[PDB]
Nucleic acid binder design. Sequence first.
RNA 1: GCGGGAGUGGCGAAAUUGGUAGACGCACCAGAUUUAGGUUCUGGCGCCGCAAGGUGUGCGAGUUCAAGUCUCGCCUCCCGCACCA
RNA 2: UCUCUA
RNA 3: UGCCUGGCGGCCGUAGCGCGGUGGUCCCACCUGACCCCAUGCCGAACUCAGAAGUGAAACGCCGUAGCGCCGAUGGUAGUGUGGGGUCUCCCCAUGCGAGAGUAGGGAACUGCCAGGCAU
RNA 4: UCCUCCUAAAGAGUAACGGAGGAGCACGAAGGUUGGCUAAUCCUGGUCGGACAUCAGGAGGUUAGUGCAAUGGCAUAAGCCAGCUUGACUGCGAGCGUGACGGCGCGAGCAGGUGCGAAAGCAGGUCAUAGUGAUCCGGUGGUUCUGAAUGGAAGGGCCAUC
RNA 5: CCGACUUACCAACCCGAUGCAAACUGCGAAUACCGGAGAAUGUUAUCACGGGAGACACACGGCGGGUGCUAACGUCCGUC
Lengths: 136, 116, 66, 81, 52, 177
Amino acid sequence: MLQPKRTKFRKMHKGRNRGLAQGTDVSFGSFGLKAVGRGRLTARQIEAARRAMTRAVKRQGKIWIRVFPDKPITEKPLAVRMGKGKGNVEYWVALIQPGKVLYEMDGVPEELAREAFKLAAAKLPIKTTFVTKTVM
Amino acid sequence: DKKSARIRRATRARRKLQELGATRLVVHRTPRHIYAQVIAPNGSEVLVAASTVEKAIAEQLKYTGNKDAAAAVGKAVAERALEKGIKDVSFDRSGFQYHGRVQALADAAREAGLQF
Amino acid sequence: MKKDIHPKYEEITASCSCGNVMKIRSTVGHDLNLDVCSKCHPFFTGKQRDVATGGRVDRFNKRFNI
Amino acid sequence: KAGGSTRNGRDSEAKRLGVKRFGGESVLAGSIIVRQRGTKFHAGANVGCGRDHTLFAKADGKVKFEVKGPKNRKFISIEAE
Amino acid sequence: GIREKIKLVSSAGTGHFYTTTKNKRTKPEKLELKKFDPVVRQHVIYKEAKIK
Amino acid sequence: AKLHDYYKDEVVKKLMTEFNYNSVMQVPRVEKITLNMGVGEAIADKKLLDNAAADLAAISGQKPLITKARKSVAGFKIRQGYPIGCKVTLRGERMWEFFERLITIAVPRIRDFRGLSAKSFDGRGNYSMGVREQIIFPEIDYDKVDRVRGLDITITTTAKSDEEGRALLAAFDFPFR
RNA sequence: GCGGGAGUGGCGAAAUUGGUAGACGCACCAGAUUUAGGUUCUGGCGCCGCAAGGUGUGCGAGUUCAAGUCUCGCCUCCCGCACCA
RNA sequence: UCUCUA
RNA sequence: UGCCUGGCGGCCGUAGCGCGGUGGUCCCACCUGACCCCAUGCCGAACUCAGAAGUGAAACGCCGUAGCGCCGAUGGUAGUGUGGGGUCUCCCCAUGCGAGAGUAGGGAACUGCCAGGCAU
RNA sequence: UCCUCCUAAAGAGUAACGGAGGAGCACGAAGGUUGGCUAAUCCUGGUCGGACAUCAGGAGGUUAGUGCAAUGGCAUAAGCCAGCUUGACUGCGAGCGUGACGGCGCGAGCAGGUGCGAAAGCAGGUCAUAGUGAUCCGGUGGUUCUGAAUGGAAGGGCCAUC
RNA sequence: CCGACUUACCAACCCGAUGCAAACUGCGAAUACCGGAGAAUGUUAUCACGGGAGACACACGGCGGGUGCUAACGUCCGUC
Ligand SMILES: [Mg+2]
Ligand SMILES: [Mg+2]
Ligand SMILES: [Mg+2]
Ligand SMILES: [Mg+2]
Ligand SMILES: [Mg+2]
Ligand SMILES: [Mg+2]
Ligand SMILES: [Mg+2]
Ligand SMILES: [Mg+2]
Ligand SMILES: [Mg+2]
Ligand SMILES: [Mg+2]
Ligand SMILES: [Mg+2]
Ligand SMILES: [Mg+2]
Ligand SMILES: [Mg+2]
Ligand SMILES: [Mg+2]
Ligand SMILES: [Mg+2]
Ligand SMILES: [Mg+2]
Ligand SMILES: [Mg+2]
Ligand SMILES: [Mg+2]
Ligand SMILES: [Mg+2]
Ligand SMILES: [Mg+2]
Ligand SMILES: [Mg+2]
Ligand SMILES: [Mg+2]
Ligand SMILES: [Mg+2]
Ligand SMILES: [Mg+2]
Ligand SMILES: [Mg+2]
Ligand SMILES: [Mg+2]
Ligand SMILES: [Mg+2]
Ligand SMILES: [Mg+2]
Ligand SMILES: [Mg+2]
Ligand SMILES: [Zn+2]
């Protein structure tokens, strides 16, 4: 499970998740899993889709993870009234805009990357798509 | 290095006279020569100037970089300033110590009639 | 230099066992008689000689004859 | 299930800093132009710097903001009026 | 608040005084300053006295 | 200034030959000699610093500048401002005369002297050596002293490289090896 | 669940104003006493080794020139409150 | 003065 | 008027670094010496003084050079004021403003006053 | 109660049992002025001497420093050394800022007298923003201002201060 | 004592590529705000003083946000 080792601050505002993404092009590898929807991916969802494509490739090829969960998410416990401070940090998310490349992959064929990224996208709440390395 | 530290050493009183609007006598000192010039409060144009590089001053002297040359320079620039009607200035040491040739120049200009 | 804070630094004569008479400025005051100077120090002959490894086979053949 | 607190309740009063008279704005002598902590601005012609780096007018006239110096620092001067 | 308070009495005979503080532990010697006395309109040496 | 005259007449001509310099100002020359005694034990008592400065004032006839800690470190139990060493800068004639008395008297008075190192020129011509024991100078009386000090010598020259200083000291017959 | 306190060698226990970490004692090891064991008596004793210094105060990061000795989080343990319909 | 046990 | 140099500015990197080259009549720099003016918590290193034997090595100045730094469009994109709309955690339409980053490209500053030197 | 940042929506201001940190002082020099200086860290060499004392050179260029929290400043240094000093002056104060108010703040300049500097000039506490407490009552010194028939006095007032 | 080399358990700096930030900024809008000039319009709509108040329990909706679960006809601010 991905998590920052150190943080400048322990808690963070809820913020918003509007705007387009930046990690749009397939930078490192040959095939990519691009986000189409909007939302937040936890560290569990990231690690589960990583497991599903590492097992689908039999550790063949190289897999990049373009995102990193750096936003802390607080929750208040059950049967706690709405005052008395901000809730306790429970888990970590990464804010995902449309166009964000989530994963990259090479060293494998295209059809194997399709079935691996499909097994990974079945572990993700947001709608994804398959992309390849574009020249320019 | 030495040039830069002299400029850093001079640029406080220069900016202070820059905001005082002071007509300022600028001394510049070399081991061989000594220079003087009276500068308008805008800092962009001069009024009078004197040196030991001028022939009319250097030919009456033994060496161009001693105290007697520096006093002859401060006398010449003061007599030119009083010729042009400039009487009250402010002495810019230009990062040198007020000592030796610089002091003998300013004492010559005080004695010849400038007021600072 | 300043005037008073420094020790006395006066020219004296230092002669050596090799007869190297040398006048130097020093804080000793009295005259000096040396033992070795840089002229007569065995840096150029003696330290070269003073390694002296010697041979083991040559020691063996030295100790007798067949 | 009662409990909690908040070690983080504090804050100080707003000091009402900023620029009191903007550019092209005629002032009297002694009029406060800028209150500020550091020298975010600097005093130019006919402008004094206070004890707390407050920029006040030494004369009467219009405020002129301008950028001078090798460091591109922001100077405030009073134009004549 | 160990820095106690004193007064700097004029040595001009007037009872005029400035009031101030000092650390009597680290500065045991008495404070003497040359200050302005508005009654005599001169600068006169003031000496440390008790704040009373 | 005996070695200064020997520099000015024969060393400059020699180095101009063995380097083929365009100008005579391009030659190396010695600039200063620095004599440090790092006395980290004077936090025990001032008198060790005060007496170590007295011995080095006899070596070079100058009053030493008592150096202090630039900052505070706790591994050595020192605070910023403690007098922790002494130095002497030697320039001019007093530099040359100390360098004469050094290479003529004191280096031969080293116990088991077998040469210096040519690997102590700090990459940029400046040579640094350290003596174990101050009694090699004859200024110090052996019965009169009690504590074996040690100092370090730093010859700062105007040579850019390391070899131009090595040739300069070798021109002064400096006993490298 | 809230609040208060503490965590140190094999053990109980100390250290102050942040300036080595183990004072002490117990237990253990060894020595001498004794036929022998116990006692009693003397001397050692936190971990790595040539003897020469380094690791070490619940876990992990900061502050400090430098922390058991501050500060935050985590952890376990102890105590008191957890009331009104 | 005290002095257990095999 | 041309060249060169020194001083004081304007402007504040298209003006700064780097690399190579180059300059000594004058100027500048280093330099020589220091009992003195003055100076070093030691030192004529610096500061200062008296000077002018030497050298342009360094520094400085000048020339060249696109390895950088820097500047930098056009178009588009993001955002957004008003009005309207939808599938309303977010977007779209009309209209107005319009970046940042990046690209092409530019680019090895320009200029004023005084003084001096050599030429004209 | 006070200070700093964010929330705070590019003037000011702006709430929550919202997110994070500090203050209830210090300094007779750690103030003023004149003169001068410029860091952190790392590399190499070097007696004891060691990851780390001091010394010399080089890279670097403020990544340091600021009496203390944070922010904004700081090379003309507001940072760091030394000399002389007491402007950590008294009476005022045009004109502005900020508050519902009480109040708080900045301030050129004027009069007197002073310190440093050759001089131009600077100085009415400290790089700034926290380091604080109304009134009443009472105490101390000064002052004929008042003084219950009159002369004093008590007491009160005013100024400084607790 | 010096060390001999080769691993695959890692890795500083630096270099290149790629992301994130309310308490980051070598950039930087739209709007808003302050000041000035100019028309047209508007029953002075503005300011000052004085007489009299009431009110200081707000609500939802849009936009920008904190908190909560971008839960609440929830809660707390800014603006309409
Ligand atoms: Mg301890
Ligand atoms: Mg039994
Ligand atoms: Mg028995
Ligand atoms: Mg050139
Ligand atoms: Mg010189
Ligand atoms: Mg050259
Ligand atoms: Mg455009
Ligand atoms: Mg652009
Ligand atoms: Mg350039
Ligand atoms: Mg160039
Ligand atoms: Mg605001
Ligand atoms: Mg706003
Ligand atoms: Mg201070
Ligand atoms: Mg100064
Ligand atoms: Mg070392
Ligand atoms: Mg100060
Ligand atoms: Mg401060
Ligand atoms: Mg009462
Ligand atoms: Mg009366
Ligand atoms: Mg009466
Ligand atoms: Mg931001
Ligand atoms: Mg109410
Ligand atoms: Mg209300
Ligand atoms: Mg409301
Ligand atoms: Mg809201
Ligand atoms: Mg809300
Ligand atoms: Mg709601
Ligand atoms: Mg409601
Ligand atoms: Mg609303
Ligand atoms: Zn001899």
